[PDB]
Amino acid sequence: WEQYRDRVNMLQQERIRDSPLLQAAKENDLRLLKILLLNQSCDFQQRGAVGETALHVAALYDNLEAATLLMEAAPELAKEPALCEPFVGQTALHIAVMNQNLNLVRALLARGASVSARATGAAFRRSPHNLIYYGEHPLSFAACVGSEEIVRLLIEHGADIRAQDSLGNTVLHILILQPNKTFACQMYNLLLSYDEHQSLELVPNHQGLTPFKLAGVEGNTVMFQHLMQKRKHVQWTCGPLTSTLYDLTEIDSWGEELSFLELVVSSKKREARQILEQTPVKELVSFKWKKYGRPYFCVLASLYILYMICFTTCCIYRPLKLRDDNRTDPRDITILQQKLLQEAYVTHQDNIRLVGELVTVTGAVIILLLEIPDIFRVGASRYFGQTILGGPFHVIIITYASLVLLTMVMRLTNMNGEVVPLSFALVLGWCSVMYFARGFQMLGPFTIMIQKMIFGDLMRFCWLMAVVILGFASAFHITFQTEDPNNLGEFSDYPTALFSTFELFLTIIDGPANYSVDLPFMYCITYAAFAIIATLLMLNLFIAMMGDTHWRVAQERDELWRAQVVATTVMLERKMPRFLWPRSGICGYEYGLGDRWFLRVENHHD
Amino acid sequence: WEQYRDRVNMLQQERIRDSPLLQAAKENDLRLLKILLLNQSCDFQQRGAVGETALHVAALYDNLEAATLLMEAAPELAKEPALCEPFVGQTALHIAVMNQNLNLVRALLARGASVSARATGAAFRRSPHNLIYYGEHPLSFAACVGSEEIVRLLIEHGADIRAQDSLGNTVLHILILQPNKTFACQMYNLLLSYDEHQSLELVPNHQGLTPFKLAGVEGNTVMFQHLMQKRKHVQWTCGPLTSTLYDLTEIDSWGEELSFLELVVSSKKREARQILEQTPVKELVSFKWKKYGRPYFCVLASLYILYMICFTTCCIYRPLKLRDDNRTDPRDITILQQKLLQEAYVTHQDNIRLVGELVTVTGAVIILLLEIPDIFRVGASRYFGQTILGGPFHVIIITYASLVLLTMVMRLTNMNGEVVPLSFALVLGWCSVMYFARGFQMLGPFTIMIQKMIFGDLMRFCWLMAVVILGFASAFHITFQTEDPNNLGEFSDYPTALFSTFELFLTIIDGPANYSVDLPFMYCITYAAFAIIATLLMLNLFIAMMGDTHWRVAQERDELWRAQVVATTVMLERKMPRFLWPRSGICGYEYGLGDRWFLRVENHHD
Incomplete structure (x- = not known):
């Protein structure tokens, strides 16, 4: 359990200590690194406790200057995850994203590191044993942390947005499951600006959940009312009052069986009742x-x-x-x-x-x-x-x-x-x-x-x-x-x-x-x-x-x-x-709108 | 009911869409407007859903540049209300007042638009179905919104202040029935500065209510104590204390039957009891x-x-x-x-x-x-x-x-x-x-x-x-x-x-x-x-x-x-x-004041 997670992290910290090549990596002892790079018979694909390379150590301890020389040591080291249990697919790209160093990410991309590296570890899952859920793909790691240029570089070098994982989550799925930040809304609008047509909004998970129903059952109402503004329509403004209307096709889901509202009220979290006051x-x-x-x-x-x-x-x-x-x-x-x-x-x-x-x-x-x-x-x-x-x-x-x-x-x-x-x-x-x-x-x-x-x-x-x-x-x-x-x-x-x-x-x-x-x-x-x-x-x-x-x-x-x-x-x-x-609602088929249902509301203000 | 009000506003938004002349009005497509004005056989007294003209559309969507050319299209269009049910007397002057555009109001007055246009619509009535009550005459629409120069122009071009309507309300009646603003008091003093002699204060409504008793039964005490300051009189000031007196002829109403105080205490609103602490x-x-x-x-x-x-x-x-x-x-x-x-x-x-x-x-x-x-x-x-x-x-x-x-x-x-x-x-x-x-x-x-x-x-x-x-x-x-x-x-x-x-x-x-x-x-x-x-x-x-x-x-x-x-x-x-x-009170007939009754009070302060 948790104690098993304790013992392996204790075990890794002596494999990092016994190897002097690995120790000079975390200690940035680049003189001895030049000495060992002058040596030829020294192995370069050495492993620590858990399928390790020196690049993971350099990315963890942020000594990029050694990581420069590690490329001419062996350029093939940037294309390898670990092999043991908890970190079975983790590559140095993920640590480089989670430490926010644009130059080192650029150097790893210069060696042609795989953008679509799939990392499904023990810690990389929604669990009360875990503390942090950041999705699975490096796009998710870029989006959760709040970077903006790194995801531009990823989309520049591939990084297909329609990417599924364990539990069938998308990027917009995992962006909802976050603590509240303005950066989440900004990155949501940013990724919506890039991807355009089907649409990404229609895909469910393995549980069968659209991101709209996901945000409904979770209840980040700041994201909710911002998301609905792409579907509202003002009618006319005159004086202090304002006429407008909304579309309710997504809200009702009349033809379907699992309705949105019943899915909202049949929740388990306490904050889900708060969304009803919108x-x-x-x-x-x-x-x-x-x-x-x-x-x-x-x-x-x-x-x-x-x-x-x-x-x-x-x-x-x-x-x-x-x-x-x-x-x-x-x-x-x-x-x-x-x-x-x-x-x-x-x-x-x-x-x-x-x-x-x-x-x-x-x-x-x-x-x-x-x-x-x-x-x-x-x-x-x-x-x-x-x-x-x-x-x-x-x-x-x-x-x-x-x-x-x-x-x-x-x-x-x-x-x-x-x-x-x-x-x-x-x-x-x-x-x-x-x-x-x-x-x-x-x-x-x-x-x-x-x-x-x-x-x-x-x-x-x-x-x-x-x-x-x-x-x-x-x-x-x-x-x-x-x-x-x-x-x-x-x-x-x-x-x-x-x-x-x-x-x-x-x-x-x-x-x-x-x-x-x-x-x-x-x-x-x-x-x-x-x-x-x-x-x-x-x-x-x-x-x-x-x-x-x-x-x-x-x-x-x-x-x-x-x-x-x-x-x-x-x-x-x-x-x-x-x-x-x-x-309930207005059938707009009598007005040439076509197969959509609407509700009118006005609002006095100021 | 409310749904009947919904259906007509839905109906109007396709009559505005089908006519391309009316659509270019709200969309300010003045090139096609020049094309249709180059045409002669195109009708200019066209109507939308509810007795409409293009000037109402231009006033609603605030495209004055088309409304300039609409005058040379037909100058008679500025002298016509609608004909259907909810907006049966509404003219473009009212929308121009409620949107606050001095140049467009000046252009409509340049065509000799009727200042005394009487608009008694379904929405233009005190009703819980309605949300906004702004009186009936364009003076009331000018005074409620808080403009100052427009009402000066109206008084310059007619606009008789002693104007009655449905329920027999005056301008000073409807100014009382407002949310609290300093602008209400300022416009009250402004209109009182213009009109001077009988007095306007004596006229009741069809219910038989003076504006003083109206303000008493409603209870906007900010307006009340400001209104009474025209009837107070200081006596002498010496040291930190100050002697003064008030007139109570309006407050007592002894000769009348419906007294002020009994009318105050026989109210229905909760705030009417608060005026008693003056x-x-x-x-x-x-x-x-x-x-x-x-x-x-x-x-x-x-x-x-x-x-x-x-x-x-x-x-x-x-x-x-x-x-x-x-x-x-x-x-x-x-x-x-x-x-x-x-x-x-x-x-x-x-x-x-x-x-x-x-x-x-x-x-x-x-x-x-x-x-x-x-x-x-x-x-x-x-x-x-x-x-x-x-x-x-x-x-x-x-x-x-x-x-x-x-x-x-x-x-x-x-x-x-x-x-x-x-x-x-x-x-x-x-x-x-x-x-x-x-x-x-x-x-x-x-x-x-x-x-x-x-x-x-x-x-x-x-x-x-x-x-x-x-x-x-x-x-x-x-x-x-x-x-x-x-x-x-x-x-x-x-x-x-x-x-x-x-x-x-x-x-x-x-x-x-x-x-x-x-x-x-x-x-x-x-x-x-x-x-x-x-x-x-x-x-x-x-x-x-x-x-x-x-x-x-x-x-x-x-x-x-x-x-x-x-x-x-x-x-x-x-x-x-x-x-x-x-x-109760002092009979000032023994002092040459004449047929008025007074109360003395002093006030220590500072």
């Missing part, structure tokens, strides 16, 4: 939402509520049966029992329950007939993790459907215990209405920070509560096991004492007391310590920790709410049949 | 309040409290009657009943109740005899929405009066159920005392932010509570319907279980337990989840959301409290007879 893209989603999205979304929520109330009233009128067995037992309350199947359907009230049950059991299966093909499309963790896409809301409803399917099988076998799996689905179905709270302005931003705060702090409080409840519960169970439970019904055995301490921790039950009789001695001294450590420190610090997290993450939840309505917007028009979805 | 207006309302308003307001509140306690003690001694019917029913408590009318008045204690009831029923009608004429004066939403004017306080008291009138009709018919409408009026009458809490310093600012916070967050919490209570209440009702309600009186049927879960959500009732008998199994596991999701997450996040809203809106509620005492001040002296309201 002006030609914000107006499209706003015009789409405020015309079609809100009415199409407000309607079916009422249908879902109408489904849930019918499910609830089906769950109410459950067939019961009087208990035939005599109970005859203290600490026992059994008065009813479950009716069998063959007695369950006689009345007209029974006949109502058939169509009550049938609507629920047919609403169960359409949940699985809606998103199970969406499971195999995107990744599994790429379907559950995204809070923007509504992560846990999709996983709770499929469990609701699984439970309501399981109880129908349970009814057919006359299996007892019907109530127990039914109650989980009953409590989760009304929690499932929370998904529809997104499309409301006053309610939407509120219901996501609670989801944040559960996985932020509820476990933190929960582990600490569970470790502190146990010894107190054990102590209260020990200190009453010589007593009558008829007078103190709490703390009778261990498991109900555990629940009693849990209820008393949350200040729900009152403190137990029987003033007619006597109490044990140390109960009074062990209870007050639990009281002052539980009610005064735990919940109050929980409130105090909640208050700061609400205050500091108040800004991100504001922008994050409008960041997820567009996911619902692109989701709804993806699954509904598009005769209810006419095309 | 120095000649703050001293007037402070001198008025601290002398007359507070004593006149503190007195009748005690009378209202004395009314309410008499109403309460009338509600206590209600005529009862022993129940004649034998109850004989478990789960039933009926021991008293209602006395009839003919038995209700025999005693002297009954005789006290007549004059107890009569004061209440005559205090009922004077509420309707106080503000029902104020309903038809201002708008209905303009009477209920303003929290400054006390919105819901007026609507609760009229319901109180309606209920106390309805119960008197109910008593005359011996109708049962008298207590039920009585209790609503009983609980609302003591809530109605909250209106009088405005005039106290330590109490006033506190009682308005609660009104803010109800409609801010109580509904947000209420929807979320109502959606989460239902499934838990249904689950607790299902899990006990095989049991004895004699041992657990909660959760017997559905509707009392719904209320029991509501009380247990607010931690009012303790958790139910009967240690002598056994519990169902899954009750213990379903209760703790509701406990940790209800008592630990809902109310605590409600507190945390309350704490930030109290902190961030703490500043606006401070200034807003003194913003509403002046509404009470102008309200009280509007309805009381003015022999208890002598005139």
Whole structure:
């Protein structure tokens, strides 16, 4: 791993030391270099640790004067990479580019060094083990570092721009994957000035990504809005206002399957949501939402509520049966029992329950007939993790459907215990209405920070509560096991004492007391310590920790709410049949423009 | 709508393209223009999409050199607006003003273009569909944009300043309705220098608004205090202090009905409250309040409290009657009943109740005899929405009066159920005392932010509570319907279980337990989840959301409290007879000034 990378770099620094020819290279001891060049029997194709030549050493330590004499030593040395593992294709041209010495690059080009040298090393790959990704070809090394004349010399001496590598990246691909510099935009415009016609913009990678969609999914918006200015068009300027229009053929990608906008919203980096505030893209989603999205979304929520109330009233009128067995037992309350199947359907009230049950059991299966093909499309963790896409809301409803399917099988076998799996689905179905709270302005931003705060702090409080409840519960169970439970019904055995301490921790039950009789001695001294450590420190610090997290993450939840309505917007028009979805934008075919779609916008300024 | 405005602007840009004469106009292809002007059979009164001429195109695209030759083409083209819908009166003078080209305006005036061209288009109106309102006449277009020599040329060649339009606005009206510029004040002083005598300041609009009241209701206080400096008068300066006085005839408007101050406080924009902190207006309302308003307001509140306690003690001694019917029913408590009318008045204690009831029923009608004429004066939403004017306080008291009138009709018919409408009026009458809490310093600012916070967050919490209570209440009702309600009186049927879960959500009732008998199994596991999701997450996040809203809106509620005492001040002296309201200010008729009223103020500075 990293340690293996350490050991080889330690190993190289003694191969550079033992050879005096190689040592005088890095030390610029050109007198001894003249002495060894006066010698003939000295080998010149010597190697260090990793396939080395002296030219790599001279390029690393920037002693060009020795590198001059190394050409008349052997001119063939400039046409050779290394041979060992991490630097398997690296030539001295790459080091000369990365050290910015125009004269030495000119001298290497004078010896006819191969411009198209392909260097695919271990360090030359996008990796968290690595720190720097500069592409693969020396054009990429020239463009990333910000030189301008060296790439002119390369284009002068070949250097085909349409050059692919591992992962199928281009020069314009790797220019996007950089920290922000003005030099990146300048070199982008410079290379676009040289290459002209197909176009370079159409080629994807091995992942199938155009550079426009690459810049979209990464989110260098400075490059993005500069790139779109080649496609804008002003209309007319008069007074302080200005009419203009944009092309949206590249933005929509209607005929394709992988749309641009869905690819943007299905990202992993945090900065990808920031690109949505650009002006030609914000107006499209706003015009789409405020015309079609809100009415199409407000309607079916009422249908879902109408489904849930019918499910609830089906769950109410459950067939019961009087208990035939005599109970005859203290600490026992059994008065009813479950009716069998063959007695369950006689009345007209029974006949109502058939169509009550049938609507629920047919609403169960359409949940699985809606998103199970969406499971195999995107990744599994790429379907559950995204809070923007509504992560846990999709996983709770499929469990609701699984439970309501399981109880129908349970009814057919006359299996007892019907109530127990039914109650989980009953409590989760009304929690499932929370998904529809997104499309409301006053309610939407509120219901996501609670989801944040559960996985932020509820476990933190929960582990600490569970470790502190146990010894107190054990102590209260020990200190009453010589007593009558008829007078103190709490703390009778261990498991109900555990629940009693849990209820008393949350200040729900009152403190137990029987003033007619006597109490044990140390109960009074062990209870007050639990009281002052539980009610005064735990919940109050929980409130105090909640208050700061609400205050500091108040800004991100504001922008994050409008960041997820567009996911619902692109989701709804993806699954509904598009005769209810006419095309947004202007069809310019009625004006002789031809097969392109546009959006008009004006802007007052100054 | 907006899309209709899109389609016409798209349509115009092909009519400009198809005509080569019109295309060479916008492209300044003056060689082909010389070719077509050498032609005679080519039409010169050609039209584009919307009543167009080539001069509009030349003025839009600022190619004056073609517009020179267009005059010798046809000089009559400079005297023609368009004919279609949105630009129905627009002439090239307006575009020439809005593009600021003095030579082209001079050339159009050389052809005798009509200065008083009236352009009333669709876009030329105050509308949220529009973005820019620049008045109607070319004087307004000159004044809004900030030119100075062009309006001198217009006044040189006519351009009557007293010019009305749609909505009856003047130049000084539309200068107020602008974003803040020093140029607005400069052009205001410039036009005031030209026009001098009646005066221009006296004319209203069709709404009946002087420009002074317009600037008051809008609140460009930079223009306001600059405008009042023409009416101030310094008295004497000696040392670091300075005596002066102001005229208040325009501010008071005593003889009129629509007063300036009430028109200011009955606004809709948020910035209109800011004008109250100006120095000649703050001293007037402070001198008025601290002398007359507070004593006149503190007195009748005690009378209202004395009314309410008499109403309460009338509600206590209600005529009862022993129940004649034998109850004989478990789960039933009926021991008293209602006395009839003919038995209700025999005693002297009954005789006290007549004059107890009569004061209440005559205090009922004077509420309707106080503000029902104020309903038809201002708008209905303009009477209920303003929290400054006390919105819901007026609507609760009229319901109180309606209920106390309805119960008197109910008593005359011996109708049962008298207590039920009585209790609503009983609980609302003591809530109605909250209106009088405005005039106290330590109490006033506190009682308005609660009104803010109800409609801010109580509904947000209420929807979320109502959606989460239902499934838990249904689950607790299902899990006990095989049991004895004699041992657990909660959760017997559905509707009392719904209320029991509501009380247990607010931690009012303790958790139910009967240690002598056994519990169902899954009750213990379903209760703790509701406990940790209800008592630990809902109310605590409600507190945390309350704490930030109290902190961030703490500043606006401070200034807003003194913003509403002046509404009470102008309200009280509007309805009381003015022999208890002598005139504020100084009557300068005793000093030979003559029929004007003044206020003295001094100012220490430096």
